């Protein structure tokens, strides 16, 4: 929304990008879940791409 060259309301420069705390077991479980879900999504995308290629060939 800010086009670089703007008066930029100096109201957000007084904050620290602090990352909230995290648990160990829950974080590892979620990491494995994300990895497997991304693997499945990439597999589905590859299947859709193969189907599109077959359609284009036909």
């Amino acid at each position: 929304r800010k086009t670089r060259h703007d008066p930029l309301a100096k109201s957000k420069i007084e904050r620290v990008n602090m990352p909230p705390a995290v648990d160990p077991a829950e974080f590892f479980v979620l990491m494995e879940r994300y990895q497997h879900y991304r693997q499945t999504v990439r597999a589905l995308r590859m299947e859709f791409v193969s189907e599109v290629q077959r359609k284009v060939h036909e």
């Binding site: 979620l30 879940r33 994300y34 995308r45 189907e51 599109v52």
Partner: protein
């Protein structure tokens, strides 16, 4: 309009009045406006329920899958809807929310037991 690599991104789009939230999944660009130009329109979304609930949602896979394979990306609410429908696997964020809700229910049960 020439966008900075405006790739196709199936995003949501409002379509209701004040005090009347209504949405509609649409296959638009990643930078185009919400209710702006779009290519194809998919099955609208019904958020508010009614008589015995009518949360209706539809999708035209024949063209949705084609546009996806054509190099289009998906947004977070798009993945949420896909997981709720069953096309894609259940979103992990939904599972985390369910686990947090279960933990909150356990805490509420503990508080209720402490009431006595």
């Amino acid at each position: 309009k020439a966008y900075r690599g405006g790739h196709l991104t199936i995003r949501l789009a409002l379509g209701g009045c004040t005090n009347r939230p209504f949405y509609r999944i649409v296959a638009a660009h990643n930078k185009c406006p919400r209710d702006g130009r779009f290519v194809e329109q998919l099955g609208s979304y019904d958020p508010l329920p009614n008589s015995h609930g009518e949360k209706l949602v539809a999708l035209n896979l024949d063209r949705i899958r084609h546009w996806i394979g054509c190099g289009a990306h998906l947004s977070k609410p798009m993945e949420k809807l896909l997981g709720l429908a069953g096309f894609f696997p259940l979103h992990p964020m939904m599972i985390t929310n369910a686990e947090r809700l279960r933990r909150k229910r356990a805490r509420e049960v503990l508080l209720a037991s402490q009431k006595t």
